Amino acid sequence: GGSPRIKTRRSKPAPDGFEKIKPTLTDFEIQLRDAQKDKSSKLAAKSNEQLWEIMQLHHQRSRYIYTLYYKRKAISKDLYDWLIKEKYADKLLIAKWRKTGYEKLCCLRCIQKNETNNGSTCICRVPRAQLEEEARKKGTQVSFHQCVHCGCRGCASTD
Ligand SMILES: [Zn+2]
Ligand SMILES: [Zn+2]
Ligand SMILES: [Zn+2]
């Protein structure tokens, strides 16, 4: 080779407990590397689907840490918190699922709306009955299925 190849950012060290889940997290880099490599090499057909597999991998990460910290109980809040702060799982996403009314949720920035200045939500969060009303209100038609943000087929819990 000739030059080294390592560039990561860390703040606090992880407790020995991290060794129990050290190789499983490394496997995600090989899967993310396939979609991450397509963005720089070979990028003509099938592109949005490649990124959906990357943001979708985040769900398996929270389920892996959630399955061992909330069910297996084989880890301590310090390691579980060190992972949430060093890019491992997502507390805001696991919190939205624990809340009430979040049965059809796919991501964190793909199902949120505001009522103060502007609205930043995704169409997949809105069911078809709500989307159909918009067409009748503007004298037009409508027909959504999946959103471009991730690989979701329209998720709506209200309807
Ligand atoms: Zn989504
Ligand atoms: Zn969406
Ligand atoms: Zn969705």
UniProtKB/Swiss-Prot annotation:
Query: What Pfam family is a match for this entry?
Result: BUD31
Record's superkingdom?
Answer: Eukaryota
**Record's keyword terms, sorted:** mRNA processing, mRNA splicing, Nucleus
Which InterPro entries does the protein's record reference?
BUD31, BUD31/G10-rel_CS
User: Where is it found, in Gene Ontology cellular component terms?
Assistant: nucleus; Prp19 complex; spliceosomal complex; U2 snRNP
Q: Where in the cell is it found?
A: Nucleus
What start and end residues bound the annotated signal peptide?
A: none
Description of how the protein assembles with itself and partners:
Belongs to the CWC complex (or CEF1-associated complex), a spliceosome sub-complex reminiscent of a late-stage spliceosome composed of the U2, U5 and U6 snRNAs and at least BUD13, BUD31, BRR2, CDC40, CEF1, CLF1, CUS1, CWC2, CWC15, CWC21, CWC22, CWC23, CWC24, CWC25, CWC27, ECM2, HSH155, IST3, ISY1, LEA1, MSL1, NTC20, PRP8, PRP9, PRP11, PRP19, PRP21, PRP22, PRP45, PRP46, SLU7, SMB1, SMD1, SMD2, SMD3, SMX2, SMX3, SNT309, SNU114, SPP2, SYF1, SYF2, RSE1 and YJU2.
Q: Name the family the entry cites.
A: Belongs to the BUD31 (G10) family.
Function, as annotated, reads: Involved in pre-mRNA splicing. Important for bud site selection.
According to UniProt, the name of this protein is Pre-mRNA-splicing factor BUD31
The scientific name of the source species is: Saccharomyces cerevisiae (strain ATCC 204508 / S288c) (Baker's yeast)
Which gene carries the instructions for this protein?
Answer: BUD31
